[PDB]
Motif scaffolding. Sequence first.
Motif, PDB file in Angstrom:
ATOM      1  N   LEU A  89     -40.068  44.461  50.153  1.00  0.00           N
ATOM      2  CA  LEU A  89     -39.919  44.568  48.698  1.00  0.00           C
ATOM      3  C   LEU A  89     -38.462  44.360  48.256  1.00  0.00           C
ATOM      4  O   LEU A  89     -38.174  43.552  47.369  1.00  0.00           O
TER       5      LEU A  89
ATOM      6  N   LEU B 212     -36.568  41.395  45.959  1.00  0.00           N
ATOM      7  CA  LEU B 212     -35.687  41.666  44.835  1.00  0.00           C
ATOM      8  C   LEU B 212     -34.257  41.229  45.125  1.00  0.00           C
ATOM      9  O   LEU B 212     -33.402  41.307  44.246  1.00  0.00           O
TER      10      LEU B 212
ATOM     11  N   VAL C  92     -32.890  59.159  41.195  1.00  0.00           N
ATOM     12  CA  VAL C  92     -33.708  58.034  40.755  1.00  0.00           C
ATOM     13  C   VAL C  92     -35.097  58.035  41.392  1.00  0.00           C
ATOM     14  O   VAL C  92     -36.084  57.700  40.740  1.00  0.00           O
TER      15      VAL C  92
ATOM     16  N   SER D  67     -22.529  56.677  40.661  1.00  0.00           N
ATOM     17  CA  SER D  67     -21.998  56.429  42.033  1.00  0.00           C
ATOM     18  C   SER D  67     -20.687  55.683  41.934  1.00  0.00           C
ATOM     19  O   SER D  67     -19.725  56.003  42.632  1.00  0.00           O
TER      20      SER D  67
ATOM     21  N   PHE E 165     -28.243  47.661  44.715  1.00  0.00           N
ATOM     22  CA  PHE E 165     -27.556  46.440  44.304  1.00  0.00           C
ATOM     23  C   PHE E 165     -26.117  46.791  43.932  1.00  0.00           C
ATOM     24  O   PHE E 165     -25.845  47.896  43.470  1.00  0.00           O
ATOM     25  N   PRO E 166     -25.166  45.869  44.152  1.00  0.00           N
ATOM     26  CA  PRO E 166     -23.788  46.206  43.778  1.00  0.00           C
ATOM     27  C   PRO E 166     -23.702  46.317  42.246  1.00  0.00           C
ATOM     28  O   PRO E 166     -24.289  45.507  41.525  1.00  0.00           O
TER      29      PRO E 166
ATOM     30  N   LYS F 142     -22.647  50.939  43.101  1.00  0.00           N
ATOM     31  CA  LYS F 142     -23.952  50.278  43.152  1.00  0.00           C
ATOM     32  C   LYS F 142     -24.945  50.943  42.211  1.00  0.00           C
ATOM     33  O   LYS F 142     -24.653  51.998  41.648  1.00  0.00           O
ATOM     34  N   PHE F 143     -26.044  50.241  41.920  1.00  0.00           N
ATOM     35  CA  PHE F 143     -27.114  50.819  41.113  1.00  0.00           C
ATOM     36  C   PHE F 143     -28.382  50.763  41.958  1.00  0.00           C
ATOM     37  O   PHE F 143     -28.485  49.964  42.889  1.00  0.00           O
ATOM     38  N   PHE F 144     -29.311  51.669  41.678  1.00  0.00           N
ATOM     39  CA  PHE F 144     -30.543  51.751  42.442  1.00  0.00           C
ATOM     40  C   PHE F 144     -31.746  51.436  41.573  1.00  0.00           C
ATOM     41  O   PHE F 144     -31.750  51.719  40.370  1.00  0.00           O
ATOM     42  N   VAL F 145     -32.761  50.839  42.183  1.00  0.00           N
ATOM     43  CA  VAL F 145     -33.964  50.436  41.462  1.00  0.00           C
ATOM     44  C   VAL F 145     -35.224  50.934  42.179  1.00  0.00           C
ATOM     45  O   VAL F 145     -35.289  50.947  43.405  1.00  0.00           O
ATOM     46  N   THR F 146     -36.217  51.368  41.411  1.00  0.00           N
ATOM     47  CA  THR F 146     -37.455  51.830  42.010  1.00  0.00           C
ATOM     48  C   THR F 146     -38.642  51.564  41.103  1.00  0.00           C
ATOM     49  O   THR F 146     -38.477  51.455  39.894  1.00  0.00           O
ATOM     50  N   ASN F 147     -39.815  51.386  41.705  1.00  0.00           N
ATOM     51  CA  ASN F 147     -41.060  51.223  40.944  1.00  0.00           C
ATOM     52  C   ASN F 147     -41.892  52.479  41.222  1.00  0.00           C
ATOM     53  O   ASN F 147     -43.034  52.595  40.789  1.00  0.00           O
ATOM     54  N   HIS F 148     -41.292  53.421  41.943  1.00  0.00           N
ATOM     55  CA  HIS F 148     -41.932  54.689  42.303  1.00  0.00           C
ATOM     56  C   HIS F 148     -43.195  54.546  43.151  1.00  0.00           C
ATOM     57  O   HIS F 148     -44.066  55.424  43.156  1.00  0.00           O
TER      58      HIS F 148
ATOM     59  N   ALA G  64     -27.418  60.307  43.664  1.00  0.00           N
ATOM     60  CA  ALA G  64     -27.923  59.250  42.786  1.00  0.00           C
ATOM     61  C   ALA G  64     -29.278  58.738  43.270  1.00  0.00           C
ATOM     62  O   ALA G  64     -30.180  58.483  42.455  1.00  0.00           O
TER      63      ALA G  64
END
Lengths: 115, 112
Positions: free
Chosen positions: A21, A25, A44, A1, A113-114, A4-10, A40
Amino acid sequence: SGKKFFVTNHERMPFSKVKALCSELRGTVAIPRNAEENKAIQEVAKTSAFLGITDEVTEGQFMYVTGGRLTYSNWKKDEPNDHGSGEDCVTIVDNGLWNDISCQASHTAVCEFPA
Amino acid sequence: GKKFFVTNHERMPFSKVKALCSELRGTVAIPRNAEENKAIQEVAKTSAFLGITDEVTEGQFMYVTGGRLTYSNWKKDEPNDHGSGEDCVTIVDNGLWNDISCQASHTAVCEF
Ligand SMILES: [Yb+3]
Ligand SMILES: [Yb+3]
Ligand SMILES: [Yb+3]
Ligand SMILES: [Yb+3]
């Protein structure tokens, strides 16, 4: 991207839990500001995921959970449709297309998150 | 809920994974039982670093957050400190563990 970056626990849960949640974080529910970020998030998440956009305040007018009117959008044909009793949340589904759905439905939690 | 998190970052060396999880106010994923081990395996898909190393005392693996191991799933003959040195751990084939170089690039998985 690039921004920013993306985060997941699915994990799949209703929108209010995804929001709680991401707050735990110290992030935000994922928001695609352009086509690259949208792909993106789609990548993810793998499966359907909530986006940080709703039309809870003004029906038909989607706003970012962080404020402001929606600019970039990738709605599926005939969406948003506020189906049935109403749909105020948004999920990214097949091809990264968007659909407005009930905030009580359970979808994959994705936080941003940036970079 | 699901305690292990992954990102859209590409594979990276252990130092970067540690930097990532700390930036996120978390810890590199640590499986403390077979159930947790399977959970990290499934969220990562590809080999991932675990929050365990033998950096402090060679041959003695410890949690990065402190303490001797209570659960392990070493592949037979592991850990073997191959070549120069393998002080980091990755969860690989069928959830088994292998000690590898901390300079190697693997999937970052964080726990909160
Ligand atoms: Yb609506
Ligand atoms: Yb809809
Ligand atoms: Yb070692
Ligand atoms: Yb090894």
